[PDB]
Amino acid sequence: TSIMAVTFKDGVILGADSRTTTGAYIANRVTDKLTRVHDKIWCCRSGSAADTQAIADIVQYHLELYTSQYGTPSTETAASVFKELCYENKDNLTAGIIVAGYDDKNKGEVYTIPLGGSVHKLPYAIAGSGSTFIYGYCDKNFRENMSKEETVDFIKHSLSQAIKWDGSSGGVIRMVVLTAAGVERLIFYPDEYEQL
Amino acid sequence: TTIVGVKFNNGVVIAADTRSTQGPIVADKNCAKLHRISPKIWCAGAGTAADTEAVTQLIGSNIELHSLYTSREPRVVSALQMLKQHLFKYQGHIGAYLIVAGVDPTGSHLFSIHAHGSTDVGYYLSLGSGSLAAMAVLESHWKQDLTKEEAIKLASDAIQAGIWNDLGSGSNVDVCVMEIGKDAEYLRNYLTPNVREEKQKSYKFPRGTTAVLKESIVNICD
Amino acid sequence: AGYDRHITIFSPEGRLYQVEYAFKATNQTNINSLAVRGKDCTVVISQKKVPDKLLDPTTVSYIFCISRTIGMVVNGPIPDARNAALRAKAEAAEFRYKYGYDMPCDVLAKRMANLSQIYTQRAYMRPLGVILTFVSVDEELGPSIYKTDPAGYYVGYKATATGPKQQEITTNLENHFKKSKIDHINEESWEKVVEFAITHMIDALGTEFSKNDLEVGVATKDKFFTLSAENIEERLVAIAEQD
Amino acid sequence: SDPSSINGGIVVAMTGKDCVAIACDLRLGSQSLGVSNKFEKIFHYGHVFLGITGLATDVTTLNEMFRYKTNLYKLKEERAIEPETFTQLVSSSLYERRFGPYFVGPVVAGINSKSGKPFIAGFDLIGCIDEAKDFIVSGTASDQLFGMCESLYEPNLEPEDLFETISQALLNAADRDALSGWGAVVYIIKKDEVVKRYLKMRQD
Amino acid sequence: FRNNYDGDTVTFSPTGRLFQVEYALEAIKQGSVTVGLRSNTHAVLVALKRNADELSSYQKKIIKCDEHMGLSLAGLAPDARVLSNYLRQQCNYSSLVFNRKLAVERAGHLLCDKAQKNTQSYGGRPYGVGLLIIGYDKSGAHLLEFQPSGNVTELYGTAIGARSQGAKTYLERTLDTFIKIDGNPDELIKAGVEAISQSLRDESLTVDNLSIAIVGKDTPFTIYDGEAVAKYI
Amino acid sequence: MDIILGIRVQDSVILASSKAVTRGISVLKDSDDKTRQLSPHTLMSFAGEAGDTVQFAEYIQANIQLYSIREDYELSPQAVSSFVRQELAKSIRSRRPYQVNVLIGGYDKKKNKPELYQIDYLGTKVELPYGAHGYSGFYTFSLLDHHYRPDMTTEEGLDLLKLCVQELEKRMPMDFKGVIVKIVDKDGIRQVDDFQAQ
Amino acid sequence: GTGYDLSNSVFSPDGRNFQVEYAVKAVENGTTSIGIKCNDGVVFAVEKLITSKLLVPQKNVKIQVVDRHIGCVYSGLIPDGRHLVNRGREEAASFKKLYKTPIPIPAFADRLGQYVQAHTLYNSVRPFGVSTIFGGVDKNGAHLYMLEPSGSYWGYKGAATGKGRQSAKAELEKLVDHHPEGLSAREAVKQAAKIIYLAHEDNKEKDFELEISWCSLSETNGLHKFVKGDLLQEAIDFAQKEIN
Amino acid sequence: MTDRYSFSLTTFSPSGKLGQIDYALTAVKQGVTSLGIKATNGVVIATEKKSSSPLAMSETLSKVSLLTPDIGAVYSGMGPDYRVLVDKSRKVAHTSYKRIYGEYPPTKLLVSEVAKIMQEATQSGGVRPFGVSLLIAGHDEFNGFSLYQVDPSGSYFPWKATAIGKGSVAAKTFLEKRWNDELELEDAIHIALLTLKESVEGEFNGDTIELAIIGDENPDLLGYTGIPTDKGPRFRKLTSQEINDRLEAL
Amino acid sequence: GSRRYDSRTTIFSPEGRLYQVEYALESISHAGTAIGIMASDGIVLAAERKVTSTLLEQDTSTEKLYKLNDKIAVAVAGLTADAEILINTARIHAQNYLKTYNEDIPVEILVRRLSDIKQGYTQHGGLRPFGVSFIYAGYDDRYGYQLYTSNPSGNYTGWKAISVGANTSAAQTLLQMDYKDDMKVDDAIELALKTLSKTTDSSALTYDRLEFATIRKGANDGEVYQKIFKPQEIKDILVKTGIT
């Protein structure tokens, strides 16, 4: 798996590959790893599919109940609920979640939650097995306040490299754009991104 | 075991082989692997046979009670959510692997479920020991906007790949077709390409062959 | 000849007085509400009354957003109303988590009616002194109005009304649906369905309304929302330029 | 090591024309040591017959369980349990102990009293129902029994012929297994009557 | 009225009263008098102990809670034992976990809350005892009055028990004098004994009748009985 | 392990049980009675894990005595054996199982028949003309297969036990220090006090 | 018949819960306390009846803080108020533990509401003998609330309860009319001192002590803080000048 | 909190009466009339749908409920009590029977479970009895067609035909005139409509009357094909139109 | 709290009687009479259905005579629903015994157990007692044919012939008159019917208002047989004895 989320001028973009393997066999080549927990709060999932699916569903439940009582939750609050579940059940979970969201006040935000259940607010985040190969690339190429098109290009170039080298990554590059305008689903096929 | 699911333009089909094994021995040459959750939601299971049957009837029972309580046709996402949360609770110890397919008021659906509680969604899926043989056929012939007839053909061909190439699969092909408008049609033994040939000899013994020590009538009545 | 009127056990006549007295509590607030179904929407109107000048008017509400799709208006005291509201929200969220789809209006109503039936049969729980009117645009049943009471009774409505002057609203609406021959307000936009509701509340109650005298909740496909005072004012201007 | 191998034993059931047979060996051992040659593994509740191979204590415990449960069934239903229904009871009872199971291989045989239809079934130790029209096999010589049944069997056999077939399936299978044998008993079951026959076999 | 609303602590009267709490308050009035007072350096408890016979001992009314805190009781002694035990544990918990001597103000809040739970739940009863807590913590000398209604009050001086109003009026007059008694323990005890004697009527303060306690700047909570209090009669 | 033998003859059940109690490198006792009377006509012998063996036997004894008082009636040997089997079967799936093997010799006064039951620690019950637990069976069963007859007198039974004990004393590695022998018949339970040199 | 006012959860024939109404009598008997919503915060004040010279001045604090941003004051049975605030604090901690953000005042108000309402549902508990005035500052502004023994609560511009509630409300209503554009925190503090003094004519027989707290975005950084020292005297002087 | 009512609210009076059961039966008497009639090849259960308002949609409230594919229930008395009894009855048919034996319970045994639930609300701590009498009609393979009444006490009785609620005394008398052991299902529907028409004051049509049968298997209602043994439910609720057909030739 | 509404079902009267047991016994005296009679070669159980109808399905009905075991049955007088609760537990107890000892449960042991359950509801729990009286008819190989009775107190006793329900005083006099120790089942069948016929509150004693059972040695077998009479068989035996 190769996943990332990048803040930019207008908000935030989540990116992911679509490959899930059991050993060397690709059990799913069109997986959707970009998961909605609220209107404009989404997450990228890595680790045990069972675990991250269960986590995300519980988080989505909490934020639905939060909204009913107290109105729209902040991205921080969503990250806090992920953290609470991951940290308190660290012995029985293998989950690496990136939480990304947009609200009008704070703009775009990215919180990464590694294996232990710690939380780290970052300008951008990368995770999944494929991410190791793009630490160098991303650190030399990321800039703050990029445009939507620049950010889409940064994610597309980054994940294409992660996919190129990581066997556990592949398929299509999915993105989810989060801004004041709303939510936009993007998808990029092998014939485009391999050529980069 | 080989099981597949294939979406088509107005519904979904699932299929399975009919071989049941205990290690390398064949117990049942015509096991029925297509289970019913509700009338229009069907299930094909692999892994620990007792677990697939148990978990399919439990959720089937709760889905019936839910349908009666809500006065609504059961949905495939409900079967999916209940199955996965049950399986996740038991951390893979319930060794059920399922392809669940069906139709309901929200449309037609096709999902896979694994023992630890993860789920996938797709237009074509396969599971079991014949998973890879079947998936090779699906990847070679699947296209979008399939007809009912093309889907049954494709799914049936995929099960055959398992039957012929996978030792864990064999015998017949069971199919069930679920179309948006109509009733689901369960096609038990849709194909029978493994009829055992007539034996060379009859082993009916002459009477008296077996030595008997003692004989008595058993009382059933009271 | 005494304690059968204090807890929920049968009187010699087979009655439950604590249930009957809980119905009485529903009218304590002296507020009337009504609900009507549109072509593809559902509208609830409730009177808003702010006696004390020291109150923040924006906090005085008997309409609740239970879920993204369901709304609930309560006739009865606010503490019990919010008790029912909080429970319904929790129930709505749990349903979606366990069963994978949004709790339907009628199913939530049945559930809350079942809970109410329990207080009617178990001694240690009192009935809530409230009548809950749930509304939505159900993905299967369309525009929906379902109402529950302290007896644990519930049913669907073409339209309904609740409060001290319930009967005046009810007969007014009955007479309209006899003339129009249909079981809903034949109008494409929800704004005109809100205007219908307010207009028929004015006729039935024989009283005019300002923008602060009303609360309005609207349900449409995939959302329930409440109107602001200014949204209502726009609506009250429309009815005046025609009356 | 294996709780299903400590005591030894086999059971086999076959369907015929308007009849069913079920047979078992009589051995009860502890590893190499043969202990009892009178250990019958077939029981019956009304007209439904249940064979049980595997760990002997569980064989006994399950017999007592199903007697207990079928007795209550008869009192409430005011009728004897039928084979199809009993098969579901056995299944659900076994699966109830999914993570601490009875180490057994049960086998149901009988004729439905209403339809007259011959019925057999087998189970794994956690209640997965093997339903077969021809035959069911269980125990330490199950490989051998599958071989013998697959070879010897044909459909629509008369009671007198089914007896010869099932007996010879059990005998020749038992003699290729150290932990099976030491006597055998065969139930021939028809709608009206049931005949029990003890077989003469090798005692080694 | 009253008759119908005094059966249990869970019932308000039509005027909003809690009669079971009020009856528990009455047990304190029947209890023997005890006085508390303080300056800026010390805090003193003085108690009039009661006996059953001339053959019996005098019921001790002062209980040490920690090295820097303690209290005197009037009413049901078994209830004082329970409440003093709780206070001993809370003082102890503060030391073990936080290495911190419990503030007398926080000790008051804890007693209030423990008494309150008995006044709102069914089946229980209020505590039938009143307590005067003295102590010296990080903000100096303190005296508290605890009533089983849950109300706790920080005072310069006070009294509880039968005829306690006499001592209370004395202290209310003497206020400006005894509050200035800094760095002199004996003189504060004198003022406490002159106060407790204001509530006398039946008898005089004898050697096994009087009980005194003191806590302060360089003084751990210490109880004086018998010949140790002979110099104050 | 400890020697536990049983034999049902015409009119009685005879139980023979070794006298040794050994822990590690030392024989602690050479006169141990590995038996409890459960009722006037029912005797149980036992062998297995150190503490479990007596604790189980006494617990069973207490229960059968309780039954006898409540009902003013002695349970049949068959009923007692079934109760014992059920208790053992419970313990095998419990936290810490009773590791005890037993023989139950009884005289059924209703049937006027002696009865011997062999039950192992798993709850494996079986009714036999003769029985052994542990390794002792590996010698005695074949010996008894040869010489046993069902119509034997009590005295012929005792001679047959002597033959079993002599074979064990010859071929078993352990010194089990002889046996205590008890006879169960219509008149109750008695001990053969002079088996050491009979 | 009769006897409907003996148990808590019981409806009278006219739909009332007499035990809650009797709890109100306990509140009406209590000391007067108020709340004043200003244009970026809230102010709380309370009357402390000085029974005797023996009460240490400035100790016996009645206003309580919840989390770091909420103030609570109440009239009636003081222990019941503390119990309620203890619950509030447990409840605010829980919210912060899960959601990270400090509990919003509306969210907090309902937490107290649901808890107080729960004590009108069963006969094995008695209702709370307090009306609680509380509030503070959150993500979107200042909030003032009053919570009755029934569990009923609303948002307020100004709130009053206790013995002198009619006097206070009358003064509160004059401020709402004469300062429509909004009052400041500085002003509200002085104005609160005035109202407690004017309300004290109901308890004029005995002496009293004034206590004030405030939570304001510009004056306290959105934290609850007590008013002490020169600012407290300035408010007392203002009230004494206004009384004459 | 805590249900501290751990004692019975139904007790014996000096005369031996169990007051709350009597009072529950009195509540049933005030309830709308319902009836059941057993034929040779089916059973019919019927009742009046008395709407509480013309603005209400009486289609959304069913007084006649499916419990299993071959078992249906109707009542007289308090509706909310009935609704929760149906929920519990449906569930207990699974947990206590179908999940054990893999088939639906026979009528007598499902009735027995419902009766047990009602008996317990007569003896358990802190509850009142159920204020309803149920009529349960059903079929199973070995018992054929059956009709049962269940009362607030938990008592139940098998009937050839009966009525309960408001005008049950008159209705029973009328059924005794018309019932025999050779009735066909359609004859029973007819007797049921005639009987029910004496109880209804106002409009008597397919919208105001509710009626269901236990009869032949309905393969068109099963929802799938392929399994010969599964032939569909025996319970069927008649439509508004189907009732009107039989009223025009009444 | 709750204390107010508690009837206190398990207390003594000043006379040392248990109120609820007495009032339950009063309830049972209105129930249809049930009679048990033991012969040398079997036991008869006869019972009267009180309140019937033409439409009551007798073929399917079973309100008084219940099977506990293949060797034990009971006749019921009182609340049927209450009886069925007790019936079911007795059936489980018999099966537990059988599973434990591999022998059918002796009759007294079953009766003692069931009567101990009744006694419990009498001494603790605060619940009403079961309004039931049982006649037990059974056979075992220790005491042969046995007849027992239990009532709501939990007291049980053994009998040669006995009645429960209504008119037991009259019925017991009639039985004591015409009973003798060397009777035969067929003579007992007649005695039981005659006795019911004289004590009935109805006009006549017809087949549709009766339940009837025998526990006989089966005539030709060697072991016990439980016969529960079908409506036609009761109609026949009613003619033989001379009551058409």
Side-chain angles (χ1 to χ4, degrees), chain B residues 76-92:
Chain B
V76 186
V77 294
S78 292
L80 195 73
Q81 198 80 335
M82 295 161 94
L83 283 167
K84 71 146 59 172
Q85 287 174 8
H86 182 81
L87 295 171
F88 181 82
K89 199 165 71 216
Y90 287 89
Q91 293 286 320

mmCIF file of all heavy atoms in Angstrom, chain B residues 76-92:
data_model
loop_
_atom_site.group_PDB
_atom_site.id
_atom_site.type_symbol
_atom_site.label_atom_id
_atom_site.label_comp_id
_atom_site.label_asym_id
_atom_site.label_seq_id
_atom_site.Cartn_x
_atom_site.Cartn_y
_atom_site.Cartn_z
ATOM 1 N N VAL B 76 -28.438 -6.115 1.092
ATOM 2 C CA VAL B 76 -27.173 -6.857 1.059
ATOM 3 C C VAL B 76 -26.133 -6.218 1.989
ATOM 4 O O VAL B 76 -25.337 -6.930 2.610
ATOM 5 C CB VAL B 76 -26.616 -6.982 -0.376
ATOM 6 C CG1 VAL B 76 -25.381 -7.869 -0.396
ATOM 7 C CG2 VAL B 76 -27.676 -7.560 -1.308
ATOM 8 N N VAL B 77 -26.148 -4.888 2.095
ATOM 9 C CA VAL B 77 -25.243 -4.189 3.016
ATOM 10 C C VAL B 77 -25.493 -4.551 4.480
ATOM 11 O O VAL B 77 -24.583 -4.466 5.299
ATOM 12 C CB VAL B 77 -25.276 -2.642 2.867
ATOM 13 C CG1 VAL B 77 -24.728 -2.222 1.512
ATOM 14 C CG2 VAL B 77 -26.669 -2.073 3.100
ATOM 15 N N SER B 78 -26.724 -4.933 4.813
ATOM 16 C CA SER B 78 -27.034 -5.349 6.178
ATOM 17 C C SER B 78 -26.429 -6.723 6.466
ATOM 18 O O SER B 78 -25.791 -6.917 7.499
ATOM 19 C CB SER B 78 -28.540 -5.346 6.419
ATOM 20 O OG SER B 78 -29.043 -4.020 6.389
ATOM 21 N N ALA B 79 -26.617 -7.663 5.545
ATOM 22 C CA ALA B 79 -25.949 -8.963 5.629
ATOM 23 C C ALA B 79 -24.435 -8.780 5.732
ATOM 24 O O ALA B 79 -23.770 -9.476 6.497
ATOM 25 C CB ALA B 79 -26.291 -9.816 4.421
ATOM 26 N N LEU B 80 -23.909 -7.825 4.965
ATOM 27 C CA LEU B 80 -22.475 -7.539 4.929
ATOM 28 C C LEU B 80 -21.963 -6.998 6.261
ATOM 29 O O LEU B 80 -20.933 -7.445 6.763
ATOM 30 C CB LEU B 80 -22.170 -6.523 3.825
ATOM 31 C CG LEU B 80 -20.700 -6.393 3.419
ATOM 32 C CD1 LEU B 80 -20.270 -7.620 2.628
ATOM 33 C CD2 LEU B 80 -20.455 -5.130 2.609
ATOM 34 N N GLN B 81 -22.686 -6.036 6.821
ATOM 35 C CA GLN B 81 -22.282 -5.373 8.056
ATOM 36 C C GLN B 81 -22.342 -6.324 9.250
ATOM 37 O O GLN B 81 -21.456 -6.314 10.111
ATOM 38 C CB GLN B 81 -23.174 -4.154 8.312
ATOM 39 C CG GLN B 81 -22.613 -3.149 9.312
ATOM 40 C CD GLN B 81 -21.572 -2.219 8.715
ATOM 41 O OE1 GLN B 81 -20.912 -2.541 7.727
ATOM 42 N NE2 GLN B 81 -21.411 -1.056 9.329
ATOM 43 N N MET B 82 -23.389 -7.144 9.293
ATOM 44 C CA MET B 82 -23.582 -8.094 10.385
ATOM 45 C C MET B 82 -22.552 -9.218 10.321
ATOM 46 O O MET B 82 -21.979 -9.594 11.346
ATOM 47 C CB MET B 82 -25.006 -8.656 10.356
ATOM 48 C CG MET B 82 -26.077 -7.602 10.611
ATOM 49 S SD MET B 82 -27.725 -8.101 10.063
ATOM 50 C CE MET B 82 -28.387 -8.777 11.577
ATOM 51 N N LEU B 83 -22.309 -9.739 9.120
ATOM 52 C CA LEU B 83 -21.302 -10.780 8.927
ATOM 53 C C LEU B 83 -19.920 -10.299 9.348
ATOM 54 O O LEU B 83 -19.221 -10.992 10.081
ATOM 55 C CB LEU B 83 -21.261 -11.249 7.467
ATOM 56 C CG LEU B 83 -22.386 -12.194 7.041
ATOM 57 C CD1 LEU B 83 -22.432 -12.342 5.525
ATOM 58 C CD2 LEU B 83 -22.236 -13.557 7.705
ATOM 59 N N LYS B 84 -19.532 -9.111 8.897
ATOM 60 C CA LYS B 84 -18.174 -8.629 9.143
ATOM 61 C C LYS B 84 -17.908 -8.274 10.606
ATOM 62 O O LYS B 84 -16.798 -8.474 11.092
ATOM 63 C CB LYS B 84 -17.819 -7.449 8.230
ATOM 64 C CG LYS B 84 -18.524 -6.136 8.529
ATOM 65 C CD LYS B 84 -17.622 -4.943 8.246
ATOM 66 C CE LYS B 84 -17.156 -4.914 6.801
ATOM 67 N NZ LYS B 84 -16.443 -3.653 6.468
ATOM 68 N N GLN B 85 -18.918 -7.761 11.303
ATOM 69 C CA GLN B 85 -18.764 -7.396 12.713
ATOM 70 C C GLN B 85 -18.743 -8.645 13.598
ATOM 71 O O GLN B 85 -18.043 -8.686 14.603
ATOM 72 C CB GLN B 85 -19.860 -6.420 13.148
ATOM 73 C CG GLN B 85 -19.677 -5.016 12.588
ATOM 74 C CD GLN B 85 -20.833 -4.082 12.900
ATOM 75 O OE1 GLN B 85 -21.736 -4.411 13.672
ATOM 76 N NE2 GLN B 85 -20.809 -2.903 12.296
ATOM 77 N N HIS B 86 -19.506 -9.664 13.210
ATOM 78 C CA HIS B 86 -19.455 -10.962 13.875
ATOM 79 C C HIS B 86 -18.073 -11.592 13.689
ATOM 80 O O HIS B 86 -17.421 -11.973 14.657
ATOM 81 C CB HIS B 86 -20.533 -11.883 13.303
ATOM 82 C CG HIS B 86 -20.593 -13.231 13.949
ATOM 83 N ND1 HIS B 86 -21.237 -13.452 15.146
ATOM 84 C CD2 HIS B 86 -20.110 -14.432 13.553
ATOM 85 C CE1 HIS B 86 -21.141 -14.731 15.465
ATOM 86 N NE2 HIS B 86 -20.462 -15.347 14.516
ATOM 87 N N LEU B 87 -17.627 -11.679 12.440
ATOM 88 C CA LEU B 87 -16.323 -12.266 12.133
ATOM 89 C C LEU B 87 -15.161 -11.489 12.758
ATOM 90 O O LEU B 87 -14.188 -12.086 13.209
ATOM 91 C CB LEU B 87 -16.128 -12.369 10.618
ATOM 92 C CG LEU B 87 -17.072 -13.321 9.876
ATOM 93 C CD1 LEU B 87 -16.911 -13.150 8.375
ATOM 94 C CD2 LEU B 87 -16.836 -14.766 10.284
ATOM 95 N N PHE B 88 -15.259 -10.164 12.789
ATOM 96 C CA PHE B 88 -14.193 -9.340 13.355
ATOM 97 C C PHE B 88 -14.042 -9.554 14.859
ATOM 98 O O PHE B 88 -12.930 -9.543 15.385
ATOM 99 C CB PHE B 88 -14.430 -7.856 13.077
ATOM 100 C CG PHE B 88 -13.345 -6.978 13.613
ATOM 101 C CD1 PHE B 88 -12.168 -6.804 12.901
ATOM 102 C CD2 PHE B 88 -13.479 -6.361 14.843
ATOM 103 C CE1 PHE B 88 -11.153 -6.014 13.399
ATOM 104 C CE2 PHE B 88 -12.470 -5.564 15.345
ATOM 105 C CZ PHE B 88 -11.305 -5.390 14.622
ATOM 106 N N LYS B 89 -15.170 -9.731 15.537
ATOM 107 C CA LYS B 89 -15.200 -10.016 16.969
ATOM 108 C C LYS B 89 -14.362 -11.251 17.310
ATOM 109 O O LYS B 89 -13.645 -11.258 18.310
ATOM 110 C CB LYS B 89 -16.652 -10.231 17.409
ATOM 111 C CG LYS B 89 -16.905 -10.098 18.902
ATOM 112 C CD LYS B 89 -18.395 -9.949 19.194
ATOM 113 C CE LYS B 89 -19.158 -11.247 18.961
ATOM 114 N NZ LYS B 89 -20.527 -11.021 18.411
ATOM 115 N N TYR B 90 -14.441 -12.275 16.461
ATOM 116 C CA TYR B 90 -13.746 -13.548 16.686
ATOM 117 C C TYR B 90 -12.348 -13.634 16.046
ATOM 118 O O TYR B 90 -11.740 -14.701 16.029
ATOM 119 C CB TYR B 90 -14.634 -14.718 16.228
ATOM 120 C CG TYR B 90 -15.788 -14.957 17.164
ATOM 121 C CD1 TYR B 90 -16.996 -14.296 16.994
ATOM 122 C CD2 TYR B 90 -15.659 -15.817 18.245
ATOM 123 C CE1 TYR B 90 -18.052 -14.496 17.868
ATOM 124 C CE2 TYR B 90 -16.708 -16.025 19.124
ATOM 125 C CZ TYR B 90 -17.900 -15.362 18.931
ATOM 126 O OH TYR B 90 -18.940 -15.572 19.804
ATOM 127 N N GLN B 91 -11.846 -12.514 15.528
ATOM 128 C CA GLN B 91 -10.436 -12.384 15.141
ATOM 129 C C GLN B 91 -9.920 -13.495 14.218
ATOM 130 O O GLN B 91 -8.777 -13.935 14.335
ATOM 131 C CB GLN B 91 -9.571 -12.288 16.400
ATOM 132 C CG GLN B 91 -9.787 -11.007 17.194
ATOM 133 C CD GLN B 91 -9.170 -9.791 16.519
ATOM 134 O OE1 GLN B 91 -8.072 -9.868 15.966
ATOM 135 N NE2 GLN B 91 -9.871 -8.664 16.565
ATOM 136 N N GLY B 92 -10.767 -13.936 13.294
ATOM 137 C CA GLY B 92 -10.399 -14.972 12.334
ATOM 138 C C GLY B 92 -10.591 -16.402 12.810
ATOM 139 O O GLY B 92 -10.382 -17.337 12.041
#
